[PDB]
């Protein structure tokens, strides 16, 4: 009841503190400064920067999961697009979080908690993308093709865009990748 | 002269693949090299001076490799460039991890950003050149060569990222297929 309230306020502080300082220079302390409470009011829930950010990843996935539950369209063509929009147009307003997330991704081979977490995100996207592709194949709207490989392909495009958008400090990279995603999909499916 | 620098580039190659970028200092490189901390300082003042050099050392053995593809046949050349970008790096996976770490630093060091950006320029130039040639030759559809090219770059970059993040070099294999699926959907 009041455990969720603190977690959420703390996740928000985290977001804000990551937006300002990036991954490397994040500290519980700076998190705490953004939370407005004592440093020990965060150590009450998390013992480490790393524990805290594993939670923060889980948090971003839930936020993402929520917004998808918002899309109830079952039309395969319309739903693919809406998912692609969700993954490629919406993030054209989180660029400062984006630097932090690439730093953290580059650290996945040294930290299981992050690696586990990023695979989790990836699986969720994979599941929801393969699912709409399968539905359309079933409705006969899409050509009967290797669904696992088509969705792996869209996964690569997605991850391409996120890296190049930060690596090149250009959110246009997602906008071009959005187009790549449509071209790719249309060539395979329709 | 430039003989000694190469051995340092090669030392930081060993210490990179061992200890990682994050856990990398002059002392550790000095160790793989066999000479004193001062002796590497003779060639590089900052660790940043060293890493920048380090960077454009890789992106230099690489162009050395592409400037081996001598063919002007557009279909063949484009596949051979895509091979070199996606098929060869599979057998050389060790450095990919630190490669990603440097990339994540690009927003913090202009020296890094500058270099990946120039490298990216060059890869885009060489990919787009084939595509253009193939259009003139009439063997690829007249296409937005700038977009098709950067589309191929999105695929290549996602592959590099995904292969370390999900710890799976076959991630480059499926991207090679994606790239061929895309290119010839656009071009042919
Ligand atoms: Cl997401």
Automatic annotation (TrEMBL), chain A:
Keywords: DNA-binding, Plasmid, Repressor, Transcription, Transcription regulation. One of its GO terms (molecular function) is transcription cis-regulatory region binding. Signal peptide: none annotated. The keyword Transcription regulation applies. The keyword Protein transport does not apply. InterPro entries: BetI_C (IPR039538), Homeodomain-like_sf (IPR009057), HTH-type_TetR-like_transc_reg (IPR050109), HTH_TetR (IPR001647), Tet_transcr_reg_TetR-rel_C_sf (IPR036271). Residues 27-46 bind DNA. Residues 4-64 form the HTH tetR-type domain. It comes from the Archaea. This is TetR family transcriptional regulator. The gene is tetR.
């Amino acid at each position: 009841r009041t455990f969720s309230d603190q977690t959420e306020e703390i996740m928000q502080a985290t977001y804000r503190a990551l937006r300002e300082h990036g991954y490397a220079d994040l500290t519980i302390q700076r998190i705490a400064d953004e939370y407005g409470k004592s440093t020990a009011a965060v150590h009450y829930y998390y013992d480490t920067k790393d524990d805290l950010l594993a939670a923060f990843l889980d948090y971003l996935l839930e936020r993402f999961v929520d917004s998808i539950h918002d899309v109830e369209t079952t039309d395969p063509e319309a739903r693919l697009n809406l998912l692609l929009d969700e993954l490629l147009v919406k993030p054209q307003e989180n660029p400062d979080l984006s630097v932090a997330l690439l730093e953290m991704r580059s650290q996945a081979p040294y930290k299981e908690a992050f690696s586990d977490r990023f695979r989790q995100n990836d699986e969720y996207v994979r599941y929801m993308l393969k699912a709409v592709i399968n539905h359309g194949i079933d409705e006969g709207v899409f050509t009967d093709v290797d669904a696992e490989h088509v969705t792996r392909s869209l996964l690569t495009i997605i991850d391409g865009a996120r890296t190049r958008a930060v690596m090149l400090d250009d959110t246009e990279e997602l906008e071009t990748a959005r187009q790549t995603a449509s071209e790719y999909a249309d060539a395979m499916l329709q």
